[PDB]
Amino acid sequence: FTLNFGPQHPAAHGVLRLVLEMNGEVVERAEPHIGLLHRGTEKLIEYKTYLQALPYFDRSDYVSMMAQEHAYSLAVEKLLNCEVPLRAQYIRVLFCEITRILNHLLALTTHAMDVGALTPFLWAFEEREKLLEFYERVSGARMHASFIRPGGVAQDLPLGLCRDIDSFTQQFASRIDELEEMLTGNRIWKQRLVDIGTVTAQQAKDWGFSGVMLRGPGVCWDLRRAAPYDVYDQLDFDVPVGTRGDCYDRYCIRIEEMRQSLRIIVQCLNQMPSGMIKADDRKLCPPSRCRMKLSMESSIHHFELYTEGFSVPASSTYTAVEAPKGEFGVFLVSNGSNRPYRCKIRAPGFAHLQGLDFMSKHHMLADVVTIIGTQDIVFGEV
Amino acid sequence: GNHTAKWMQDRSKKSPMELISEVPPIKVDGRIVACEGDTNPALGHPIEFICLDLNEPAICKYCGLRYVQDH
Amino acid sequence: PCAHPEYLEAVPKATEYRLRCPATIDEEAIVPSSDPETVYNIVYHGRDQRRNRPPIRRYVLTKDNVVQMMNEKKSFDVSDFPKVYLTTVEEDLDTRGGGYE
Amino acid sequence: VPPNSANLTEARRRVFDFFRAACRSIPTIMDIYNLQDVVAPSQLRYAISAQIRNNAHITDPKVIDLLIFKGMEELTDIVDHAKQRHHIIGQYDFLKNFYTSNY
Amino acid sequence: DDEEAEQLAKEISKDWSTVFERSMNTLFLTEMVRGLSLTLKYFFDPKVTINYPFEKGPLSPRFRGEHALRRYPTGEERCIACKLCEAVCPAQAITIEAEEREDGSRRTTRYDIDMTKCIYCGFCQEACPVDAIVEGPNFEFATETHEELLYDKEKLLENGDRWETEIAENLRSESLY
Amino acid sequence: AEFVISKVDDLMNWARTGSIWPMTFGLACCAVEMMHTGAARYDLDRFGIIFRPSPRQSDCMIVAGTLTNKMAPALRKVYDQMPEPRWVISMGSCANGGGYYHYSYSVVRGCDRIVPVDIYVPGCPPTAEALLYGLLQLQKKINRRKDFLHWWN
Amino acid sequence: AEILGIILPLLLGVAFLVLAERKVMAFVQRRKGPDVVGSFGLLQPLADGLKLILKEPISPSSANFFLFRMAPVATFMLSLVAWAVVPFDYGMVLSDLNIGLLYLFAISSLGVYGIIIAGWSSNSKYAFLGALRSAAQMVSYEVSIGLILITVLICVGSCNLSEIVMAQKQIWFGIPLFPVLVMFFISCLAETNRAPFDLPEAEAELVAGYNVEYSSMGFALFFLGEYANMILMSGLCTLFFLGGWLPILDLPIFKKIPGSIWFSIKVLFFLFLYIWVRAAFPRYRYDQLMGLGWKVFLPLSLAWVVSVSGLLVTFQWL
Amino acid sequence: TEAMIRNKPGMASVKDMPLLQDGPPPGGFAPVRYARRISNTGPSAMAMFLAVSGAFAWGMYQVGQGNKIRR
Amino acid sequence: LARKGTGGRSSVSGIVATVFGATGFLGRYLVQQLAKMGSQVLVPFRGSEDSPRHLKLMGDLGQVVPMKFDPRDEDSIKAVMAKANVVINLIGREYETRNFSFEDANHHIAEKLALVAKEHGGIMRYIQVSCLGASVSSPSRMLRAKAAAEEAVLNALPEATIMRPATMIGTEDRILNPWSMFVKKYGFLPLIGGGTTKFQPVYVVDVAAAIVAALKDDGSSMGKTYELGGPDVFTTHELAEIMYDMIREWPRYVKLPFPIAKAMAAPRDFMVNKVPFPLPSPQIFNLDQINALTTDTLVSDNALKFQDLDLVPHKLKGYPVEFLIQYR
Amino acid sequence: KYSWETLPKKWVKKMERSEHGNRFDTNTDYLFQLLCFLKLHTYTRVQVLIDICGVDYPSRKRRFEVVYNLLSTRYNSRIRVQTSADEVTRISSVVSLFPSAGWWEREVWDMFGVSFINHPDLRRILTDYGFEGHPLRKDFPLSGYVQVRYDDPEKRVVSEPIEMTQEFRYFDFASPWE
Amino acid sequence: IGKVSGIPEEHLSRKVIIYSPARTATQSGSGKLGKWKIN
Ligand SMILES: NC(=O)C1=CN([C@@H]2O[C@H](COP(=O)(O)OP(=O)(O)OC[C@H]3O[C@@H](n4cnc5c(N)ncnc54)[C@H](OP(=O)(O)O)[C@@H]3O)[C@@H](O)[C@H]2O)C=CC1
Ligand code: SF4
Ligand code: SF4
Ligand code: SF4
Ligand SMILES: [Zn+2]
């Protein structure tokens, strides 16, 4: 018995087009259909410079924007050998972590709105509209902040942003507590989530989950502890790791990972060195407006970096960061030219949404939206 | 003008060419000027050093402003 | 009787927040571009990163080389083995810093 | 399916296999997409045969394997309601060019 | 194993005056009354809402909204036709054609940003050498018809003169970065 | 006189402009911005806008995100089952016009190729207020309908 | 007759309950609800209505007019006729039936027909099975409401609703049988669908879960029906358990004690409780839901009939 | 350049450039809480059962006395 | 014309048309042909701006420019035909409306557009669309008016093509869609006059393909009144036989003598009397459509057919009638 | 590296790198056999197929290069086994070893055309349903061949005609002197 | 490998020109030579 389970609530899971082969109410197999959001991203990037390539990444995962620009930047610094300053690293993490918070605040309470709890959605989205007052203030666009450029980061924080991020972090433990007091204790929540989509660790490894769905099963594997790719080796934070694997562990993790991300934000705030914002290598970082206008040699680079590009040397690397969805890695083959060459984007949600087939076997049809909830399936990456 | 008749169809607001051809040329001292832009060297064009050896005013290519030697 | 242990008193409504609106330049930021040691010393080939790298050394192995290597590898003693990334789980409630970071 | 086409013989064998499959599947094609009135089974067999014959001059076995795979893909997406029907009905001298364009 | 796991996870809470605690917290729905109480606290608290047309959300001088071609204080469009923004544009929205005007100084005969084919990433504002193209904080230009949304060659992007009073402010405050 | 017709059109338009429930084809991030425009700060339930989860009963359809060539038939099939006094809002550059992906093979060059559009919310990630202003422009498009005066020709 | 004076104000009550729910459930979410249409959204219900009325049909289909064009009429007529016996104040019941309560039980047993028929006439297998699931839920929390009413009936003498609200002059049955009010509310939540218990009413599965031919009138009538059934099943948690129209009896000098105003205040409390409890709690999945009406609210309802019968038989309190 | 963009009149040297950018105040920010401080200071298991059972014993006695008055 | 392109949807065809009846059943196919072969279309609409919305697509970013105009007020028709070289006229009604009478909607407009196009010297091809058999002394006042329209568009503007499409079938048509939704009166089809009428319907796509084919043609097809008949000369009963093949229903016709019908359509003919209320557009029973139904003059004589446009019409079975499946 | 000593020399056939992530450019025949190694091995335990990156080199003779990434959650290392298969060479599928390879190989076949051997359900995952052509190749034009889709008299249907759009402007930024 | 490549028929009868782009005469630098391109 085949059922074309589509997007239950649009605007939350946009193009979800599962084709469930059911058995009464018990689902026997879930066959997701991809491509409804397949923009030509892995082709369009081959046609544009390494700078023009960056805006696609904030548009790859639309609920955790800067994590993908941070995964791309670290793939055009893996090749460029472009050492970025300490302040660029600290800002880059303070925003990758603000993005982890922006994602878990959505991927928890959009999940909690698919399950049925209507209010956590709107509380978490007031919180997200506080964090977009930081995105929009530091770069310009509330969602797609093309801000974490290859060398360092686009431009320094405004002169009042750390004070505001602090005044937000002080009041954010309470918001997590409310999102938690409203959902963690509920017997209507546990019942809707405990023993739902349980993934034994061998399955989370096999299906390349590598995210909050690889730390549910108990595999202690965070690419901020495994492969520290910034000040992360300096910052202190504990990676919460589940013990059962059910969608109630992944929720409890995403609601603790939203507190450890608060620890990382507070650290990045309390220790942010007053250094240069971009790599001093002005052939990888366009010089400031003031310098390119006054200096002829800076003007030449501002011209050959906003038209030509880097021309990062010939290589091929797989740089993977811990994006909120999971291990978002961008395999970036680079022909010597200024344009990338098959900038393949390993995006979790392409490996997670595979897991829907075995996660939601023998679960009731109303659980198939809870699974899609805890996978944090955002179809931009799929 | 005719070039300005390609992008502007208003023809009531003065054409930028006239707005810059009606500003007087700026007297200066030396033989080279800066014309960094409006006033703020960071909100104007890249600094363009103009030569004033000729008698006629030498326009700044980026801003249209005109400079004369003022000996 | 709820999640208010004199700590939710940090409430969401701020009412004094972004007190200095962004486009108001009370303090003019500086945002250093280059380190002071690299302002009047613009030698680049030392600082270069794009092109200052050893060239790719792609040398071929023929059967002789690999049979030599297999015969040279007499035994796989410990420390010729990849180390395990040891990670165990350990329950902790709020002990890191006392809940205050 | 492994490319057992180490020769044109196995490839031709599986070409005939795919041809028999498409022919014996024409019933469901006519049913799901309602061509049993516009098109005759003779005509659909004619079209499938003209397809398999239009690309008959392929001395390469692997290219024939891939052609049969594309054909099986097309069929499987026609059998099920994956693609629509208004194309299936469509799937089934110099001067007169000069007057129109320059190409 | 799940059978033994259940037996043990239920033999953990197996001492009187603990079975009673759990029974009175699953019968007098007590986890749920802490949900209702929080929900009430938020029912009575002030509302984080904004009656939009009259007051609007906070922005920043770096905010990227409607593209505006700036002008030099003394008229003269700031846009010398270098085509750097046409080059840097990721979506290739800007189409620039250049002609030496009769005055002799280069200028763009055609400067058409296609807003629909535009990602509002601010690359044009960065790439332009003289700050000729900047994004005005407008962001309120929803158009009834698509053809209007294609911003014409240097005529509608020349409406930035109205927004110059705010664009000049944002630039005077952002240029420090 | 005609005044009664003018007021009955004002009334019909006030209804259709007060309660305008859109089937929010929230594909991609502009659905995340649309969710912020439905969220606590910029209420859309204030202006009557109630995000319907079904095309059956909906006055509008705020298509957002990249309309993929594969989600084009589904968008058209959804638009064909809205009740006739329907409108469509394109939100984001990818939905209104070709956008960042204008030249992508799999991306339609703007939903204006599938559904007839009535208000294009501009800006690739429109500010939540910008989508809100696009809807406050759709409200104007309603207030300029006067369908009764046209039924009387 | 005077049935207009109980249907028209109830129609206005339902129309303004759609707004009361949106607005209260919005205030909960830290946001003002419908607030532009009227002075405070007060005209928003009229806007929703006048919009649904002016929406052209998707297909006329006036041919099939006896099958499912009178089934929403039936559901709504039942939800409205169960209002006769509900007394708003002493001698304000429209028809004091000496078996009033059992008549409400029968009206529910016919609402089951309403749902089943209006779901079967929708020739959609998914929507029909959804309507059947919703009917089985509405009828499985009806044995629990039945036994809860048998409790509040043992406490009272007769089924006469005016007596059940007159039998509380000493104390409301909400104070001694509070555990029962919680079970009647959590059942009235589940008998009607609007609840933590609304998987058949999961936002999408509801619209595609009642009919195929909407034409707007069907959509409004189902929601007008659900909101009247809700005003009713909240006007029962306030007759039986809360004092139907009884004050706290302190007899204040400031308060002249109107009856219908007290009944109104209490039914407002229970409507606000419907909303609050829709906001703050996740859905039950209809597979734990049916396993909560049988395995949780039937044993805990049977026990209560034996407890309130025992404790009233031993000590002659009957 | 970079010594003509960050002036600081004087300074005798390329170091000691102004360098005024955003950061934490001297001494860092306050210690921010991140743990879950959910206060369980409500009515206990008892006191909730004994409030309920006290009511279904005195309130039921009141129901009985009200039944006596009504009879 | 001055064509610079390859196909359409971004090409140019030098045809900046003003399809006067674009917001109509024939108009949506003709506009799609003209704007899919890549040519501008200045669709003028009469009332609600929602009328030509379904035409803002099918044309690439200004290839279809819907414009507002009042039918009785010129200086607005001249504004719609300001920048135009082709002017097709699809403005016609089958039912008298209290405001616009049969002549004021079929003849006194086509003559008016003809004159105001003549004045606007530059309209290369002016196509005039009227029903087949619309010759004077035809019973239906719609056809007498549509004949006077032809005679006044040719006189006031020679070399003006005149299509004569017979009843056109297709989606959202006025011939089959009223019969269905009256089969929804329990299979009861009231074929009037006993189905002795002989009329040649035609797939509306092919009428559009002919209207565009007289534009792409050379100097010919100017002043030559075609007759876009179609294949398979049918009878009303026989055409109804094909509907019941698509919509799954059992043929349950009845015969209606013409007096019975004209009495059943005697109401809705007081249109000029009932001023304070417009009547609901008589769909199936139209006294004038019935007067036309009487005499089977709706057959293509030796006048120009589709064959004189290198064009052959589609049939009326299969896809060109598959819009009826939505009634099953 | 330990992995190269134990691995049969024939399996790492063509190439081997030693930075930017190490790779074993192997042969298509020994691939799933090589993927069987590095997994289910005590000292090399990958277990996690992170990614399968098709890469198209038009100037090669074996056009494509199916780059299998592999993470080793145990030893915390990442190896990138590669291959090389042209347009008509069915390559071994590793969905049997790492079941995540299912969708990645569907995408590699869809984008490129590198059919996978004994891969169950090898069906176009990303591109349109009636899609003909393989996008992420090099010779596939950006705007696609026939990929405009508009509504028309064929109501409720979006056609798939030949494509026409504002010409993608390719900018020749690449400068001499590299 | 033309038919399996999914390219439409009308674009496999195309006539191409396999040149090697000459050096841009304006700039005397050979860093873009030796890259044969189908035209
Ligand atoms: N339908 C048929 O079966 C047949 C029709 N024809 C002829 O084909 C042409 C188009 O047919 P079709 O589109 O179906 O016809 P419709 O009756 O649907 O009308 C089509 C167009 O005519 C316009 N129109 C009609 N009367 C007036 C008026 N008084 N003032 C302004 N505009 C007016 C309509 O404007 P609006 O939409 O705003 O009312 C619409 O744009 C007409 O000449 C018709 O007689 C030929 C053969 C038979
Ligand atoms: S922001 Fe500027 S550069 Fe970027 S796409 Fe838009 S117009 Fe082009
Ligand atoms: S806007 Fe800037 S980049 Fe574009 S042409 Fe003008 S000066 Fe050059
Ligand atoms: S237009 Fe921009 S913001 Fe909108 S969906 Fe597309 S990429 Fe996202
Ligand atoms: Zn100047």
CA dist F25 and F42 (Å) reads 19
Spatial CB neighbours of F85, under 8 Å, sequence gap ≥ 6: F16, F59, F147, G54, G55, G56, I50
| Minimal CA separation from D64 to chain J, in Å | 9
- Chain H touching partners, 3 or more CB pairs below 8 A: A, C, E, G
Smallest-distance ligand from the CA of B36: 5
Smallest-distance ligand from the CA of I105: 1
E133 lines ligand 3 (CB under 6 A): yes
Nearest CA in chain I to J155: I171
Nearest CA in chain B to A298: B46
Q: Based on C-alpha coordinates, what's the Rg of chain E?
A: 30
Smallest-distance ligand from the CA of I298: 1
CA dist A115 and A183 (Å) reads 11
Sequence letter at residue B53: D
Strand-strand pairing, E94-100 and E106-114: antiparallel
Sequence letter at residue A344: K
Here the tokens at position I3 are 């064509």
CA dist A365 and I4 (Å) reads 56
**Residue H20: how many other CB atoms lie within 10 Å:** 17
I54 lines ligand 1 (CB under 6 A): no
Contact of chains C and K by CB distance (3 or more pairs under 8 angstroms): no
Q: Give the closest residue (by CA) to ligand 1 atom 10.
A: I90
Selecting from C3, C5, C39 the residue whose C-beta is nearest the C-beta of H14 gives: C39
CA dist H4 and I226 (Å) reads 82
CA dist A348 and E109 (Å) reads 47
Spatial CB neighbours of H35, under 8 Å, sequence gap ≥ 6: A173, A259, C93, C94, C98, C99, C100
The residue range of the domain holding D43 is 1-103
Contact yes or no for E139/E66 (Cβ under 8 A) = yes
Q: How many domains does chain I have?
A: 1
Which structural technique was applied?
cryo-EM
F66 lines ligand 4 (CB under 6 A): yes
Beta-carbon separation of H48 and E28 below 8 A: yes
Nearest CA in chain A to J49: A208
DSSP letter string, A59-127: TTSSSSHHHHHHHHHTTTTTTTT----HHHHHHHHHHHHHHHHHHHHHHHHTHHHHHT--HHHHHHHHH
3-state SS class at G264: helix
Beta-carbon separation of D37 and I319 below 8 A: no
E93 lines ligand 2 (CB under 6 A): yes
Selecting from A9, A116, A123 the residue whose C-beta is nearest the C-beta of G283 gives: A116
Beta-carbon separation of A346 and J53 below 8 A: yes
CA dist A214 and I186 (Å) reads 62
Contact of chains D and K by CB distance (3 or more pairs under 8 angstroms): yes
Distance from residue B51's CA to the centre of ligand 5 (Å): 13
I→G interface, C-beta within 8 Å: 181, 184-186
CA dist D36 and D32 (Å) reads 10
Resolution in A, one decimal?
3.8
The angle formed by the CA atoms of residues A86, A88 and A89, to the nearest 5 degrees, is 65
Of E71, E77, E78, E84, the one to substitute when testing ligand 3's pocket (max ligand atoms within 8 A of C-beta) is E84
Distance from residue I218's CA to the centre of ligand 1 (Å): 27
Q: In this complex, is the C-beta atom of J132 within 8 Å of any C-beta atom belonging to chain A?
A: no
Q: In this complex, is the C-beta atom of D80 within 8 Å of any C-beta atom belonging to chain J?
A: no
Contact yes or no for F93/F99 (Cβ under 8 A) = yes
Sequence letter at residue A234: Q
- Chain G touching partners, 3 or more CB pairs below 8 A: A, E, F, H, I
3-state SS class at C69: helix
Beta-carbon separation of E24 and H42 below 8 A: no
3-state SS class at A322: strand
Beta-carbon separation of I11 and J152 below 8 A: no
Beta-carbon separation of K31 and J175 below 8 A: yes
Residue G269 CA: distances (Å) to CA of A218, C1, G235, G277 = 46, 22, 10, 12
Instruction: Tell me the residue length of chain C.
Output: 101
3-state SS class at F139: helix
Q: Which atom of ligand 2 is nearest to the CA of E127?
A: 3
Q: What are phi and psi of J122, to 5 degrees?
A: -95, 90
Contact yes or no for A77/A84 (Cβ under 8 A) = yes
Instruction: Tell me which chain B residues have a C-beta less than 8 angstroms from the C-beta of A290.
Output: 41-42
Strand (E) or helix (H) holding E125: helix E123-127
Q: C98, exposed or middle or buried, with CB in 10 Å at 0-12, 13-18, 19+?
A: exposed
Q: J112, exposed or middle or buried, with CB in 10 Å at 0-12, 13-18, 19+?
A: buried
Contact of chains I and F by CB distance (3 or more pairs under 8 angstroms): yes
Q: How many domains does chain D have?
A: 1
Q: What is the 3-state secondary structure (H, E, C) of chain I?
A: CCCCCCCCCCCCCCCCECCCCCCCHHHHHHHHHHHHCCCCECCEECCCCCCHHHHCCCCCCCCECCEECCCCCCCCHHHHCCCCCEEEECCCCCCCCCCCCCHHHHHCCHHHHHHHHHHCCCCCEEEEECCCCCCCCCCCHHHHHHHHHHHHHHHHCCCCCEECCCCEECCCCCCCCCCCCCCCCCCEEEEEHHHCCEECCEEHHHHHHHHHHHHHCCCCCCCCECCCCCCCCEEHHHHHHHHHHHCCCCCEEEEECHHHHHHHCCCCCCCCCCCCCCCCCCCCCCHHHHHHHHCCCCCCCCCCCHHHHCCCCCCCCCHHHHHHHHHC
Q: Which atom of ligand 1 is nearest to the CA of I132?
A: 47
Q: What is the 3-state secondary structure (H, E, C) of chain B?
A: CCCHHHHCCCCCCCCHHHHHHCCCCEECCCCEECCCCCCCCCCCCCCCCEECCCCCCEECCCCCCEEECCC
Selecting from F119, F129, F134 the residue whose C-beta is nearest the C-beta of E57 gives: F129
Q: Which CATH architecture has domain A2-381?
A: Orthogonal Bundle (1.10)
Here the tokens at position E60 are 């920043």
Strands (E) located in chain A: 2-3, 19-23, 26-31, 315-322, 327-334, 343-346
Ramachandran bin of K2, using left for φ above 0, alpha for ψ from -120 to 50, beta for the remaining angles: alpha
3-state SS class at J38: coil
Distance from residue I213's CA to the centre of ligand 1 (Å): 20
CA dist E151 and E149 (Å) reads 6
